[PDB]
Motif scaffolding. Structure first.
Motif, mmCIF file in Angstrom:
data_model
loop_
_atom_site.group_PDB
_atom_site.id
_atom_site.type_symbol
_atom_site.label_atom_id
_atom_site.label_comp_id
_atom_site.label_asym_id
_atom_site.label_seq_id
_atom_site.Cartn_x
_atom_site.Cartn_y
_atom_site.Cartn_z
ATOM 1 N N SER A 28 0.742 -1.381 -0.177
ATOM 2 C CA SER A 28 0.021 0.095 0.141
ATOM 3 C C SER A 28 0.907 1.131 0.090
ATOM 4 C CB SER A 28 -1.030 0.196 1.259
ATOM 5 O OG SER A 28 -0.332 0.183 2.539
ATOM 6 N N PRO A 29 0.463 2.563 -0.675
ATOM 7 C CA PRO A 29 0.980 3.552 -0.667
ATOM 8 C C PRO A 29 1.158 4.139 0.717
ATOM 9 C CG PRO A 29 -0.483 3.437 -2.376
ATOM 10 C CD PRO A 29 -0.586 2.182 -1.618
ATOM 11 N N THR A 30 0.381 3.864 1.437
ATOM 12 C CA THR A 30 0.592 4.446 2.867
ATOM 13 C C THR A 30 1.446 3.774 3.615
ATOM 14 O OG1 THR A 30 -1.319 2.936 3.576
ATOM 15 C CG2 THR A 30 -1.699 5.620 3.301
ATOM 16 N N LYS A 31 2.000 2.541 3.371
ATOM 17 C CA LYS A 31 2.868 1.832 3.960
ATOM 18 C C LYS A 31 4.273 2.277 3.543
ATOM 19 C CE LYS A 31 2.020 -2.839 5.440
ATOM 20 N NZ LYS A 31 1.835 -4.226 4.999
ATOM 21 N N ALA A 32 4.400 2.536 2.378
ATOM 22 C CA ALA A 32 5.623 3.069 1.647
ATOM 23 C C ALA A 32 5.969 4.299 1.929
ATOM 24 C CB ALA A 32 5.468 2.978 -0.027
ATOM 25 N N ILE A 33 4.990 5.337 2.302
ATOM 26 C CA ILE A 33 5.404 6.704 2.686
ATOM 27 C C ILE A 33 5.971 6.565 3.942
ATOM 28 C CG2 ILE A 33 4.255 8.879 3.594
ATOM 29 C CD1 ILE A 33 2.703 8.744 1.024
ATOM 30 N N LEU A 80 9.463 5.117 4.005
ATOM 31 C CA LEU A 80 10.533 6.178 3.463
ATOM 32 C C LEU A 80 10.676 7.439 4.535
ATOM 33 C CD1 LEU A 80 9.515 6.772 -0.338
ATOM 34 C CD2 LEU A 80 11.504 5.706 0.537
ATOM 35 N N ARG A 81 9.790 7.639 5.036
ATOM 36 C CA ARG A 81 9.941 8.770 6.240
ATOM 37 C C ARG A 81 10.714 8.383 7.296
ATOM 38 N NH1 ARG A 81 4.176 11.865 6.624
ATOM 39 N NH2 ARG A 81 3.977 12.367 4.524
ATOM 40 N N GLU A 82 10.443 7.113 7.706
ATOM 41 C CA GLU A 82 11.108 6.627 8.845
ATOM 42 C C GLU A 82 12.721 6.439 8.521
ATOM 43 O OE1 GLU A 82 10.360 4.112 11.934
ATOM 44 O OE2 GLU A 82 8.129 4.545 12.015
ATOM 45 N N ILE A 94 14.481 7.943 6.051
ATOM 46 C CA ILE A 94 14.777 9.336 6.045
ATOM 47 C C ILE A 94 15.291 9.682 7.554
ATOM 48 C CG2 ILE A 94 14.866 11.528 5.566
ATOM 49 C CD1 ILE A 94 13.296 11.290 3.101
ATOM 50 N N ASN A 95 14.453 9.604 8.452
ATOM 51 C CA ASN A 95 14.866 9.812 9.860
ATOM 52 C C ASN A 95 16.021 9.141 10.242
ATOM 53 O OD1 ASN A 95 14.055 11.390 12.271
ATOM 54 N ND2 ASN A 95 13.543 9.266 12.851
ATOM 55 N N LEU A 96 16.334 8.026 10.035
ATOM 56 C CA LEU A 96 17.649 7.334 10.410
ATOM 57 C C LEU A 96 18.567 7.870 9.458
ATOM 58 C CD1 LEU A 96 17.604 5.260 12.339
ATOM 59 C CD2 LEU A 96 15.323 5.225 11.159
ATOM 60 N N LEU A 97 18.398 8.106 8.409
ATOM 61 C CA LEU A 97 19.684 8.776 7.646
ATOM 62 C C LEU A 97 20.085 10.051 8.230
ATOM 63 C CD1 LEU A 97 19.004 7.387 4.048
ATOM 64 C CD2 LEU A 97 20.787 6.777 5.852
ATOM 65 N N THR A 119 21.577 9.381 -0.614
ATOM 66 C CA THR A 119 20.498 8.424 -0.644
ATOM 67 C C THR A 119 19.506 9.224 0.060
ATOM 68 O OG1 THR A 119 21.965 6.583 0.291
ATOM 69 C CG2 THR A 119 19.985 6.436 0.882
ATOM 70 N N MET A 120 19.418 10.244 0.944
ATOM 71 C CA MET A 120 18.397 10.719 1.479
ATOM 72 C C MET A 120 17.888 11.639 0.350
ATOM 73 S SD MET A 120 19.624 12.644 4.756
ATOM 74 C CE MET A 120 18.993 13.843 4.369
ATOM 75 N N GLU A 121 18.663 12.094 -0.560
ATOM 76 C CA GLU A 121 17.926 12.886 -1.647
ATOM 77 C C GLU A 121 17.053 11.940 -2.699
ATOM 78 O OE1 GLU A 121 18.449 16.798 -3.410
ATOM 79 O OE2 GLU A 121 18.387 15.777 -1.619
ATOM 80 N N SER A 122 17.802 10.583 -2.959
ATOM 81 C CA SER A 122 16.826 9.965 -3.656
ATOM 82 C C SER A 122 15.660 9.420 -3.159
ATOM 83 C CB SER A 122 17.641 8.627 -4.056
ATOM 84 O OG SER A 122 18.230 8.839 -5.175
ATOM 85 N N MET A 123 15.558 9.282 -1.600
ATOM 86 C CA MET A 123 14.388 9.008 -0.835
ATOM 87 C C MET A 123 13.260 10.103 -1.007
ATOM 88 S SD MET A 123 15.768 6.823 2.134
ATOM 89 C CE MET A 123 16.456 5.123 2.096
ATOM 90 N N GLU A 124 13.856 11.062 -0.776
ATOM 91 C CA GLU A 124 13.080 12.546 -0.910
ATOM 92 C C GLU A 124 12.212 12.509 -2.298
ATOM 93 O OE1 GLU A 124 15.373 15.758 0.569
ATOM 94 O OE2 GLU A 124 15.238 15.205 2.576
ATOM 95 N N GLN A 125 12.895 12.215 -3.145
ATOM 96 C CA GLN A 125 12.273 12.331 -4.513
ATOM 97 C C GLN A 125 11.260 11.459 -4.713
ATOM 98 O OE1 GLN A 125 15.094 12.039 -7.744
ATOM 99 N NE2 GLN A 125 16.078 13.978 -7.422
ATOM 100 N N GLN A 126 11.550 9.898 -4.012
ATOM 101 C CA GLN A 126 10.603 9.144 -4.434
ATOM 102 C C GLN A 126 9.317 9.462 -3.296
ATOM 103 O OE1 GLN A 126 10.411 6.333 -6.191
ATOM 104 N NE2 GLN A 126 12.328 7.094 -6.970
ATOM 105 N N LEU A 127 9.411 10.400 -2.251
ATOM 106 C CA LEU A 127 8.254 10.581 -1.651
ATOM 107 C C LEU A 127 7.509 11.550 -2.119
ATOM 108 C CD1 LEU A 127 9.034 11.393 2.141
ATOM 109 C CD2 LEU A 127 7.247 9.858 1.206
#
Length: 123
Positions: free
Chosen positions: A1-6, A9-11, A13-16, A66-74
């Motif tokens: 589910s999209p919500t799961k993915a968001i 990704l947010r979590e 990013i937090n770690l990164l 990595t963060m940047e790629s992740m942010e783009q995906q979000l």
């Protein structure tokens, strides 16, 4: 589910992000050691400290990437979600208007009946 993915990704990013701050701290400390050595001592030590600082910088750049790629995906998902909403609403509005195109224009009982009647009579 999209919500799961968001959420992932947010979590993630937090770690990164946590790592980024740590990396930044190491970078400043290493630079500082280089400064004192240049005083209370030998260059060689300072040069060595700076080289270490650079490799900590290059690692940081990767963390940042990595963060940047992740942010783009979000953003792409959050953007896609909105489009879906636009499409559904647009889809919904077409259904509502269809029920309207029906109205009493199609709810003409006599016109319909006579038409049915003639075909019966026609046989």
């Amino acid at each position: 589910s999209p919500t799961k993915a968001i959420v992932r990704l947010r979590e993630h990013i937090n770690l990164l992000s946590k790592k980024q701050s740590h990396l930044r701290t190491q970078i400043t400390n290493q630079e500082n050691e280089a400064r004192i050595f240049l005083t209370k001592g030998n260059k060689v030590m300072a040069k060595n400290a700076l080289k270490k600082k650079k490799t900590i910088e290059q690692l940081l750049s990767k963390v940042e990437g990595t963060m940047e790629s992740m942010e783009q995906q979000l953003f792409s998902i959050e953007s896609a979600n909105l489009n879906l909403e636009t499409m559904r609403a647009m889809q919904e509005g077409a259904k509502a208007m269809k029920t309207i195109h029906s109205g009493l224009d199609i709810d003409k009982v006599d016109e319909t009946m006579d038409e049915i009647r003639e075909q019966v009579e026609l046989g």
